[model samples]
Target: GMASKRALVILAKGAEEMETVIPVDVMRRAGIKVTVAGLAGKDPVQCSRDVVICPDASLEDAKKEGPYDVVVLPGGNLGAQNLSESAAVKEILKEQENRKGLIAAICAGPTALLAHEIGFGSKVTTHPLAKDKMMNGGHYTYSENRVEKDGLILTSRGPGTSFEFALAIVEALNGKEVAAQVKAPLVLKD
Candidate 1:
């Protein structure tokens, strides 16, 4: 059978490459439809590490295609700021929240959730440097874990924890068995 789950990964300029790629790749490995959407039109996005990626479509286009099972945001300070500033992103997230869909963000990505008022009161986590920003309003409780899932919001720390974060997402959308099946071939730690 074809994949019934879909994911949208929003790629903003200066996004952390590892955080973005790991989740997209891992979710696809787990048999999900993953769409990489660019914030700045369809041109290549320069990541924080300076790696460039051509997104599958612009956010303007992708949002039209979505009612995605999950919307993922990857973090770099500037990237998260851009995401936070977008009216398009805010609308997308608000709709997702209203529908009680999963929203996964990593590192500084969680800060964008604060910007859009999504997942308020959900326990969340972020890269240490973003703790203050994400915690500023006391709207959501913070966790120091590699990954945190509170209701429909899924959050994780930084690059080092990307794999765990991705696997956790796969588990949430798929199942533990599917996550484990995908994890095995990657030679990931048991």
Candidate 2:
């Protein structure tokens, strides 16, 4: 199967607001079909900072309509944990695997990969505070490294790497040219 032209990004009730939105928005700017999915129906889910994002589709709904080219996960403690519990989320990842679709997560988002057993016997990096909980290897650092790529899996250190991670995602899905254009202002080259 060819890579998906569309991407399905999942966010639980307490998703990291910035991390969640940045990659989705960045990908859209690069002409990728990025859909935000959450639990229940398409409604606003609150972030730790009290910001609310209205998802494009509900997790329940996306399970049927999804099986996208990629799946992005933004990190937050409760939110990432909750998202892991969704059988639908795990199923979507399986779909991605079957389709050779990309799987990306940031900060605590990578932890969810563990919950789904995808991180088993692998290496990953996540939020410093949550590193011990990972089923795989993780490198700890300050500023959450802007982006880290492993095979088809991409991760951001935390909110700080939002731009780099998002832009890198665009590059991964699109191309270096588009990534350069989007990252110019972010100064990834410098």
Candidate 3:
């Protein structure tokens, strides 16, 4: 039917397992085509807390499936740093921003956004520990919301807010009804 939304999740070594998995799982439940892309290679990624996740494709391969509905970045201190340092990630995000596609980040993941200068001048939120890092240049206004969305960038505070972040993504891509349907089955009180 050509109606399914596509999502690319960039996974790097030291990423927060919860932050990465929650969005992938939620997006898939909303009938989105979710591609878990390994930042380093098409191999298993060791997350910050000993969680190892196998990616569906390498970042290079995933990039071939370009112009995804959303590009998601999950956060961990080291994971964010790795994403920040990757030229590949920078390129992908820059293209996404230029195209006005959605770019979502959580926790320290926003620090990587800061690194790439993706959403300068938008209101963003990050894990409390990453606030200073994201604000280093005073380019973006900061928020304390569990989930924040301004322009093409959507951000969240920490792992605890991953579900909310994912729902917001669903709402943005699919619609409020789809987001609510996806939200209801999770046994979480609204």
Candidate 4:
């Protein structure tokens, strides 16, 4: 049962392109109202290497109403540092932790979750470089597979794991059956 159809996907400056887009594309294909929100106001969000993405909404606009079923954090260059340090973004992540809302992060995105102290002791994964950070931050680290699901939190490695990461979100928000259906057409297996 979903109270709201909307799912807010958080993006920020220097976000990895694939990590941010692949999952969103898959989720939208599954009929989810995925809205991209960047820390910046209404405008095309700039990513690593000047990659620009026009978000559906801005953080300022999205904060007006939430209580959403899901909040997705995409990892790219500098994304973890940008998001983890934002008071508003930190608050949102904290709220999700308290309510057990479905929250997914990949690549360096998990670092942001770690910074919020929401995934401590939870089996998680992140960009290879941040494995030390994740471990040092007190998260139980796992990296063999593409993604891992611990209750409400979902995490993945890097761009290589984008599909699996998105599929994880689909599976969590919907179910294995729906995830399979949504995943089949993509021809990308787990």
Clashes of each: 0, 2, 0, 1
Task: Tell me the TM-score of each prediction against the true structure.
Answer: 0.98, 0.87, 0.98, 0.92
**Candidate 3 per-residue lDDT over residues 30-103, each given as its tens digit:** 99999999999998999999999999999999998888999999999999999999999999999999999999
Inter-residue clash pairs, candidate 1 = none
Q: What is the C-alpha RMSD of each candidate to the true structure, in Å?
A: 1.0, 3.5, 1.0, 1.9
Give the per-residue lDDT digits (tens) of candidate 4, residues 28-133: 8767888888787778888876789998788988866787778888887487778888888889888878887888998888888877777666778788887887
How much is 4 displaced in model 3, in angstroms? 1.7
Off by over 4 Å in 1: none
lDDT by residue (3-70, candidate 1, tens digit) is 59999999999999999999999999999999999998999999999999999999999999979999
CA-RMSD of model 1: 1.0
Kindly report which residue stretches of model 3 are placed more than 4 angstroms away from their true locations once superposed.
none
Pairs in clash, predicted candidate 4: 16-76
